[PDB]
């Protein structure tokens, strides 16, 4: 619960300027007077997402598929274990 409300809070509280309140006039002159010329503020959104290229996309996706096969065979190994399969065997 701790980690969940931490991430929920940080998801929208992380997009706050690094300028301190004593040095907030610079950010004000940079953005608050810039607001009026646009209907909607189109500032770059502060997130941790990254743009993925095609080659890295494929190179990753094949790797998750291979480790998914590794997980699936292991999964079968555990589905052998519980005594239910033993009793119906």
């Amino acid at each position: 619960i701790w980690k969940f409300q931490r991430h929920d809070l940080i998801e929208e509280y992380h997009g706050r300027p690094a300028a301190p309140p004593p040095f907030i006039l610079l950010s004000h002159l940079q953005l608050f007077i810039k607001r009026v010329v646009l209907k909607t503020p189109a500032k770059r959104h502060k997130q941790l997402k990254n743009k993925l290229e095609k080659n890295e996309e494929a190179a990753l996706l094949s790797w998750e598929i291979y480790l998914k096969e590794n997980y699936l065979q292991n999964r079968q190994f555990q589905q052998k274990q519980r005594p239910e399969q033993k009793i119906e065997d």
Binding site: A59, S62, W63, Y66, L67
Partner: protein
């Protein structure tokens, strides 16, 4: 070029290949061509090699073929040595 595929034979071949090649210092000897199970041995090679702790090449797969049976021989001949050895598939 005279071959056919079915699922569980492919699974058996691939599983045997990685289990025999990943352990010890096994050397797998096979021809040179990308056709059928002959291509599938190599595709299993990279299926294992894409996710590897030591990375790079953990397998030594030797290909044997006849110079007469080579499509793009033009460019594979050098007097002493240049070694880009480009061979587009």
């Amino acid at each position: 070029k005279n071959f056919n595929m079915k699922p569980r034979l492919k699974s058996i071949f691939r599983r045997g290949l990685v289990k025999v090649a990943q352990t010890t210092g096994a050397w797998i000897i096979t021809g040179g061509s990308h056709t059928g199970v002959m291509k599938q041995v190599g595709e299993a090679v990279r299926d294992f090699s894409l996710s590897s702790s030591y990375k790079e090449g953990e397998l030594i797969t030797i290909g044997v073929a006849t110079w007469g049976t080579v499509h793009r021989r033009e460019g594979l001949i050098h007097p002493t040595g240049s070694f880009p050895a480009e061979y587009i598939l």
